[PDB]
Amino acid sequence: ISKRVNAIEEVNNNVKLLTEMVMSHSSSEDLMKELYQRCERMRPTLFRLASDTEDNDEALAEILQANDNLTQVINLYKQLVR
Amino acid sequence: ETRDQVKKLQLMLRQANDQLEKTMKDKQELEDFIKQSSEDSSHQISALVLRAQASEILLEELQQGLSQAKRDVQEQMAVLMQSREQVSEE
Amino acid sequence: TRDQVKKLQLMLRQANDQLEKTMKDKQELEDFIKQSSEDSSHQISALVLRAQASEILLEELQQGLSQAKRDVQEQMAVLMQSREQVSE
Numbered sequence: 001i002s003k004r005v006n007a008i009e010e011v012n013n014n015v016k017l018l019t020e021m022v023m024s025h026s027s028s029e030d031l032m033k034e035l036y037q038r039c040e041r042m043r044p045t046l047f048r049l050a051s052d053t054e055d056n057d058e059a060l061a062e063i064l065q066a067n068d069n070l071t072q073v074i075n076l077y078k079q080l081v082r
Numbered sequence: 083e084t085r086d087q088v089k090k091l092q093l094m095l096r097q098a099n100d101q102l103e104k105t106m107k108d109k110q111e112l113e114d115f116i117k118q119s120s121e122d123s124s125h126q127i128s129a130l131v132l133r134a135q136a137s138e139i140l141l142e143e144l145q146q147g148l149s150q151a152k153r154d155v156q157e158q159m160a161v162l163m164q165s166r167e168q169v170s171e172e
Numbered sequence: 173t174r175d176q177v178k179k180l181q182l183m184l185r186q187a188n189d190q191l192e193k194t195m196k197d198k199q200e201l202e203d204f205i206k207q208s209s210e211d212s213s214h215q216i217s218a219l220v221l222r223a224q225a226s227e228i229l230l231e232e233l234q235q236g237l238s239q240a241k242r243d244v245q246e247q248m249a250v251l252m253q254s255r256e257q258v259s260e
Binding site: 084087088091092094095098099101102105106108109112113115116123151158 | 173174176177180181183184187188190191194195197198201202204205212240247
C-alpha cells in the first residue's frame with residue numbers, strides 16, 4: 001500500500017501530462033512517445049496490484065480507477081499520434 | 083459496485099491477454115532478427131576470410147618476386163664490381 | 173458476488189506472472205541486440221582503420237617499385253651507350 005500508492009500517484013501525475021502532450025500535438029513528439037512508452041509498462045504493475053487486493057474493496061477501487069485513466073490516455077494516443 | 087468491480091477486472095484480463103500477445107509476438111521477432119542477422123554476418127565473414135586468404139597468398143608471391151628482384155640487383159652489382167677490379171688488373 | 177472478484181483476481185495474477193516473465197525475456201534480447209551490435213561497431217571500425225592504413229602502405233610500395241623500375245631503365249640506358257663506345 002506504500003507501493004500501491006506510488007504506483008497510483010505516478011499514474012495519475014502522468015496521465016495528466018501525457019494527455020496534454022497528446023492534444024498539444026495538433027521535436028515534441030520525442031519527449032512524448034517516450035512517456036507513452038513508460039505508461040505502457042505501468043499496466044503490468046496495475047495488474048499485479050489489482051490481483052492482490054484481498055477484499056480491500058476501496059484500495060482495489062483506487063487501482064482500477066487509475067487503470068481507467070491510464071487506459072483512456074493510452075486509447076487517445078493510439079488514435080491521434082497513431 | 084461489485085458489478086463495476088467485476089467489469090473492470092474483466093477489462094484488465096482482456097488487456098493483459100492483448101499485451102501478453104503482443105509481447106510474445108515481439109519476443110519472437112527479436113529472436114528471428116537475431117537468428118537471421120547472426121547467419122548473415124557469418125556468411126559475410128566467411129567470404130571476407132576467403133578473400134583475405136587469397137590476399138595472403140598473393141602477397142607471398144610478391145615476396146618471392148621482390149626477392150628475385152633483389153638478387154637481380156646483386157648479380158648485376160657483383161659483375162660491375164668484379165669487372166672494375168679487372169680493368170685495373172690490365 | 174465476491175468469488176467473482178476473487179476468481180478474476182487469481183486469473184489476473186496468472187496472466188500477470190506470465191506477462192512479466194515474457195517482458196523480461198524481450199528486454200533481455202533487446203539488450204543483447206544492443207551489446208552485440210555495439211561490439212560490432214568497435215570491431216568493424218578497427219578493421220576499417222587497418223584497411224585504410226593498408227591502402228596507404230600499398231600506395232607507398234607502388235611508388236617504390238616505380239622508382240626501382242626507373243632505376244633499372246636508367247642503368248640499362250647507360251649500358252647500351254657504353255655498348256656503343258665498344259661496338260664502335
